[PDB]
């Protein structure tokens, strides 16, 4: 009964299950390690059935729900033990949400047929304001300023949150109890996004002081700071490798960070409407890149404030493919509000034709790791699902889900079922306001809640 | 925490070894002794501590590396 014998037993049981499920076995065994090869190996875009998706909107009492993070246990092929923290949580799917109301809430999302079920929550307030007024003394257990982001540890043991109070509180998943507080130690070091390295305890935090901080949650320690962005680092995405990718908003640059190599690759759009119009013979100049998601260890996608969704490759500095005005144009302002004149024709002239029209922003953008399908979000009122080409040189619109109404601040996807037959559950946090600010005019019908859509595969 | 990274690794079977450059990130710490670096390098490379030799460490101006 040596440890070598125990692994052999578990490996033998695993093969027996694979025989029961079923060339096929050899192919399936390769797919167990396809993630180590950073390539797209999940081609299920054509098998998805968007039309028959079961939509549902769950209302929440929190105002301006800011981010959502989902935890899915995964079987470890090396040890054949599930990622669930305890035996009780075997095969339990969780989602964690944060809002500008300073509330962290965990939900149960195991049952795809049922709505999310609240389990526990933690709220902050004015009691947690530090008295010291020194940055290194900002070590209070709760939040006192807007929470902007949340991330669930891949081991199911910790959930970490951060926001405008310049702290990084790590909570226990079971009780939502704070176990460590890590100040960023900067006057303008507000945490804007968090990304865990897949199947690892390494965390990447993109802050407002133009820097990226990396932590080891198991050690509860900051490791390094990355420099190079010339404006706020708004979003950050990571995969199994140590190659996180970030976007810098107004500096209009995406950066890929090779952490072991201590180098970075800089990507820039460089589109100009005059040539775009000429080649055609409404095109909007990009102002800032707000969202990013890694399709692959070698590919990622970004969404800009002009509605452009671009596909990138590590080999090329410029985008390989772009989807302009992905979510359409904002409604034209009412002529009864543009001007105070009685004559309608005078008011119509103030609309200036179509010059005041501006595109929807890409507020959310999520790509399922190592697949060919990704989801975008805005406040248009629908979630659009896109499929990437087999050669990874383009993408097309797979479908839409119109249930969501409001600002899509964050998107997540969780799957269940056997290898052949997966049902995909899309969870999106919906707010009445943009996460970073209150600029967006109130959208008619927008509500604060959790948008849910269950998608099944047939063919 | 202290981070240790190895780069420019050359397998040199002529001298029966692996040669590399070692980067140590030690924020809020003066520096890392050669002995403890040898212990951690032995751990990561799965070798005896007696088989690891480290030298020529220069702290960067400003500290921390």
């Amino acid at each position: 009964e040596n440890p070598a014998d125990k692994r052999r037993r578990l490996a033998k049981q695993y093969l027996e299950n694979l025989k029961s499920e079923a060339d096929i076995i050899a192919s399936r065994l390769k797919e167990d390690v396809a993630e180590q090869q950073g390539r797209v190996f999940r081609y299920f875009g054509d098998k998805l059935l968007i039309s028959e998706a079961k939509q549902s909107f769950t209302r929440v009492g929190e105002n301006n729900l800011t981010c959502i993070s989902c935890f899915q246990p995964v079987l470890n092929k090396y040890t054949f033990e599930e990622s669930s923290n305890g035996d009780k949580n075997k095969g339990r799917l969780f989602a964690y949400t944060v809002s500008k109301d300073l509330q962290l809430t965990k939900y149960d999302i195991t049952d795809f047929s049922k709505r999310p079920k609240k389990l526990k929550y933690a709220k902050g307030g004015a009691k947690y304001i530090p008295t010291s007024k020194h940055e290194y003394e900002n070590t209070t257990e709760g939040h006192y300023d807007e929470i902007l982001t949340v991330a669930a540890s891949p081991d199911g043991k910790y959930v970490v949150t951060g926001g405008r109070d310049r702290k990084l509180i790590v909570w226990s998943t079971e009780s939502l109890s704070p176990v460590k507080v890590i100040p960023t130690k900067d006057r303008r070091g507000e945490v804007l996004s968090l990304a865990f390295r897949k199947n690892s305890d390494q965390l990447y935090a993109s802050c407002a002081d133009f820097k990226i901080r990396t932590y080891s949650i198991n050690q509860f320690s900051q490791l390094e700071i990355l420099y190079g962005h010339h404006d706020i680092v708004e979003d950050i995405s990571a995969l199994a490798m140590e190659r996180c990718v970030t976007v810098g908003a107004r500096d209009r640059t995406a950066m890929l960070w090779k952490i072991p190599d201590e180098t970075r690759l800089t990507f820039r759009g460089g589109d100009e409407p005059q040539k775009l119009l000429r080649r055609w013979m409404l095109f909007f100049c990009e102002g800032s890149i707000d969202v990013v998601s890694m399709v692959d260890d070698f590919h990622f996608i970004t969404g800009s404030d002009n509605g452009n969704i671009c596909l990138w490759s590590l080999a090329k500095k410029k985008p390989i493919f772009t989807e302009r005005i992905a979510h359409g144009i904002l409604p034209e302002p009412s002529f009864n509000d543009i001007s105070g004149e009685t004559d309608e024709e005078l008011r119509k002239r103030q609309l200036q034709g179509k010059k005041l029209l501006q595109p929807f922003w890409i507020t959310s953008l999520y790509a399922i790791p190592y697949s060919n399908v990704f989801i975008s979000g805005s406040w248009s009122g629908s979630l659009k699902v896109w499929k990437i080409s087999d050669n990874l040189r383009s993408f097309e619109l797979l479908g839409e889900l119109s249930g969501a109404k409001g600002v899509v601040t964050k998107i997540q996807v969780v799957e269940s079922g056997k290898h052949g037959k997966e049902k995909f559950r899309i969870l999106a946090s919906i707010a009445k306001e943009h996460r970073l600010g209150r600029w967006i005019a109130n959208v008619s019908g927008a509500r604060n809640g959790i948008y849910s859509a269950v998608i099944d595969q047939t063919g | 925490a202290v981070t240790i990274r190895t780069r420019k690794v050359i397998s040199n079977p002529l001298l029966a070894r692996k040669q590399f450059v070692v980067d140590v990130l030690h924020p809020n710490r003066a520096n890392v002794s050669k002995d403890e670096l040898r212990e951690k390098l032995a751990e990561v490379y799965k070798a005896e501590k007696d088989a690891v030799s480290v030298f020529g460490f220069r702290t960067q101006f400003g500290g921390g590396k």
């Binding site: 050690q219 490791l223 072991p260 | 925490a1 202290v2 240790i4 190895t6 690794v9 951690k40 990561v44």
Partner: peptide, 28 residues
């Protein structure tokens, strides 16, 4: 639009990828 010969003149060893890569670890 209409507007729109005889040339008289072993491979090297293929490059091998690095056998070893960098390793990283953190402690304390």
């Amino acid at each position: 639009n209409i507007l729109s010969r005889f040339d008289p003149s072993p491979r090297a060893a293929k490059k091998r990828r690095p056998a070893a890569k960098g390793k990283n670890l953190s402690f304390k």
